[PDB]
Amino acid sequence: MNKAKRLEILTRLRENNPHPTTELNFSSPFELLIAVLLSAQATDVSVNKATAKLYPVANTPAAMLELGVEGVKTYIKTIGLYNSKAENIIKTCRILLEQHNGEVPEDRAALEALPGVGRKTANVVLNTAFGWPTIAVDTHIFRVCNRTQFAPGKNVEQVEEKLLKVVPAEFKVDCHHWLILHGRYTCIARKPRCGSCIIEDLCEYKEKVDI
Ligand code: SF4
Numbered sequence: 001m002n003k004a005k006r007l008e009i010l011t012r013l014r015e016n017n018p019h020p021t022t023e024l025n026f027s028s029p030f031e032l033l034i035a036v037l038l039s040a041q042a043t044d045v046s047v048n049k050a051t052a053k054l055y056p057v058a059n060t061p062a063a064m065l066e067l068g069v070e071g072v073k074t075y076i077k078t079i080g081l082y083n084s085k086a087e088n089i090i091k092t093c094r095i096l097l098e099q100h101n102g103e104v105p106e107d108r109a110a111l112e113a114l115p116g117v118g119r120k121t122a123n124v125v126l127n128t129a130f131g132w133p134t135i136a137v138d139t140h141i142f143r144v145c146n147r148t149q150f151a152p153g154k155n156v157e158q159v160e161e162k163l164l165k166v167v168p169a170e171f172k173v174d175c176h177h178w179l180i181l182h183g184r185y186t187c188i189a190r191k192p193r194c195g196s197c198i199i200e201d202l203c204e205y206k207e208k209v210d211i
Contacts, residue, residue, distance in 0.1 A: 001149040001204060003166075009150060009202050010171045013178040016198055020177035022128050025051060029104035029129040030096075031059055036125060037088055037116045041080045050076045061093035061102050088116035106130050124176070133172035135163045140183030141176065147187060149204040 013020075023044040026032040031051070038047045054075040058067045067075075072086040079085065092114045096102055104125070105111060111122035119136075126132035137145075137160045145151040145159050151166055153159035167175050186193045194200055195210030 005202055006150060006166055007168065009148070009199050010167070010175075010178075012198055012202075013182065014171070014174070017178065017181070020174050020181055022124075022177065024048065026129075028059070029125070030061065031055060032129045033092070033104050033111075033114075033117070033125055034064075034089060036121055037092065038076060038079055038085060040085070040116075046079055050079050061096045064093045065090060065097070085116070091115045092117075104129065106132075127173065127176055131173055133169065135160065135167065135172065135176045137163070138180065140187075141179045143189065144179050144183040144187050147192070147203065147205040148199070 022032070024032065024035040024039070025048050026035055035047050035051055038050060054072075057075070058064045058071075064072065069086050069090050072089055073082055076082045076085060095114060096104065100110065106126065108119075108122050108126060111117055111125060112119060117125070120138070123132075123134040123136040127134045127136065135141075137156045142153075142156060142159055145153070145163070151159055151162040153162055163175065164172075182199075186197050192205075192209055194203075194205075194208040197203070200208065
């Protein structure tokens, strides 16, 4: 692949969807942090169904703490691992109240310190709630980057590091959401939708499927 081809792929993804975002519903950084903590081994539609019940009754660290571990579990019992999720939620709300004064902190090490949130999660929250140029790589973005040859790599860290070198600064805030929505709905794992792909003539995959 090369610089000019990469730039035309990013130009077509912007034309198609100028402002890509998460499929998790949220109206605040805190509501995004909790939705992302509820995401582990669950679908976005499962999480949105649970937060549609929960956030009208408690959507601040203080209201959440007042609901308690067992009150939280009542609203999220439909989601996988909800007992440990409910513990991580209450603990994170306490830390935000004490150390960060009821705010979600705009800082990677502070977010990574929170129970249940790791590097990829901190990067997704900094990008999606605060607009940071971070580009977290999951299995979808890994498959898309290697199939197209946009940013090939042998594991997650190599693709993440290549993406931070090859994506122009202009495109780095929307890059993660463009590539994950492309992987989820077009460049899917079993039988890619190549005959209907908006970047098919720029993609370098040798096994394209419906011409
Ligand atoms: S042409 Fe096929 S392999 Fe290439 S990006 Fe599109 S869907 Fe994926």
